Amino acid sequence: PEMVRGQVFDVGPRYTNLSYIGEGGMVCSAYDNVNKVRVAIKKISPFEHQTYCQRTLREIKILLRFRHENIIGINDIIRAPTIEQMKDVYIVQDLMETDLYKLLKTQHLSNDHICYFLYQILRGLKYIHSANVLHRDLKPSNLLLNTTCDLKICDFGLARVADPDHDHTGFLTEYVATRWYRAPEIMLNSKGYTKSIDIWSVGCILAEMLSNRPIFPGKHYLDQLNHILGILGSPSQEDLNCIINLKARNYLLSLPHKNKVPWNRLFPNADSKALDLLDKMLTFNPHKRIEVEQALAHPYLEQYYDPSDEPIAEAPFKPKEKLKELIFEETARFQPG
Structure with missing residues (x-):
């Protein structure tokens, strides 16, 4: 033995x-x-x-x-x-040689590497989502890389079949994903049963690739929302109207107004197309958040985009x-x- x-x-x-x-x-x-x-x-x-x-x-x-x-x-x-x-x-x-957590701790990524990594993440995610599966724990350490930077998504231990009709829940109850990569709605009114949860995480990963630092490093569960709103600024009326839950909505209405931090100020060296995509991934309102297929089609990824080489699952999970x-x-x- x-x-x-x-x-x-x-x-x-x-x-x-x-x-x-x-x-x-x-x-x-x-x-x-x-x-x-x-x-x-x-x-x-x-x-x-x-x-x-x-x-x-x-x-x-x-x-x-x-x-x-x-x-x-x-x-x-x-x-x-x-x-x-x-x-x-x-x-x-x-x-696999390494993972994106390890790589980000030591290596500056060129814009070409960020683009390629993002492409591969989204390509894999298109397939996952096409199988009606939510990964629910996307984060750098679950993105494996070999010596030629081929990327593979791992760790489906927390995955779920998507269930958007049962996604609603109460305030400060849900813990889905790893904190820094957890979408604002998880804290507010979401069980994390919709694909937008994964897109948020990808958004966070993209931001982290741009700067080698997590964009929303919450010190603890509650601080995570502080970080998100500190950058995204206060949600709009329309977005708050989308939150029917009173505890969640009234919590947000109780906060002092916060303005948006412009992405090109947070990431002065970033490709503008990357920031446009980032913006769309890190949209507060999960209904308005870009979906995986739209993200693949975004100008930032145009060098790689090829729908016929972005396969979907033959046999979605029920x-x-x-x-x-x-x-x-x-x-x-x-x-x-």
């Missing part, structure tokens, strides 16, 4: 020469003796918990169905031959013990024979 930091990392004879990558459960790289490339392997041990089972099953199901150049695939899944003996699952994925069986069944295809 292969060990890494005194923990079982039991990936069998196919995968040898392991290195600790990080405890995201545990991630290691390994040499794939069939394909003769190094690969990334994630040990998952979810079987005690409803929620870990749920996220693991949901994610395996999604990644196995999706097939897209800008979405991480599952290459293999390793587990014991029986439910009884299955205590962990190993997911094998392409080893207790723990049973989830273990479903995880066991979902991973069956990877067993010998």
Whole structure:
């Protein structure tokens, strides 16, 4: 049994020469003796918990169905031959040089790189959204990059089927996405069941690519809205009229007027077309926010835009013990024979 930091990392004879990558459960790289490339392997041990089972099953199901150049695939899944003996699952994925979190911490991005990264994010997102799926946790660290800057979206653990008719909820209740990338409506009146949630996150990522700093670095859940409104300025009457919930609307009406910070002041070196797109992605009113297909068609991305090479999904998506069986069944295809 292969060990890494005194923990079982039991990936069998196919995968040898392991290195600790990080405890995201545990991630290691390994040499794939069939394909003769190094690969990334994630040990998952979810079987005690409803929620870990749920996220693991949901994610395996999604990644196995999706097939897209800008979405991480599952290459293999390793587990014991029986439910009884299955205590962990190993997911094998392409080893990627880096991720956009890592890259932003150290590397200035040229406008060509920002454009290309944005294109690839949106291309992948077009596919996701076309499958009626919301990623719901887009952020730099979930955007993987190889040495030639090919980008792949990962981590669908928090994804959901879109459900715009049931999106409404009360004020300060919802926690969807990672804070800095969370759309204002999540705090106000949204369960994050609409595609606009992901576009907001992409907007935030784009801003972060322009400056290497998060645009809305909320210190905590509540501060996040302070940041958003500090840049977007006070919502318009029309946008407030769109919020029927009184607690949310009256909270916003209670705030002192704040003016918009012009994007070309926040990002003086940015391409003007990039800022135009950014503006459209970081629109306060999620109904007015650009959608993924419009974003791909924006002038900023004209060098790459090619709808015929921006595929959509063929097959949109519509207790723990049973989830273990479903995880066991979902991973069956990877067993010998």
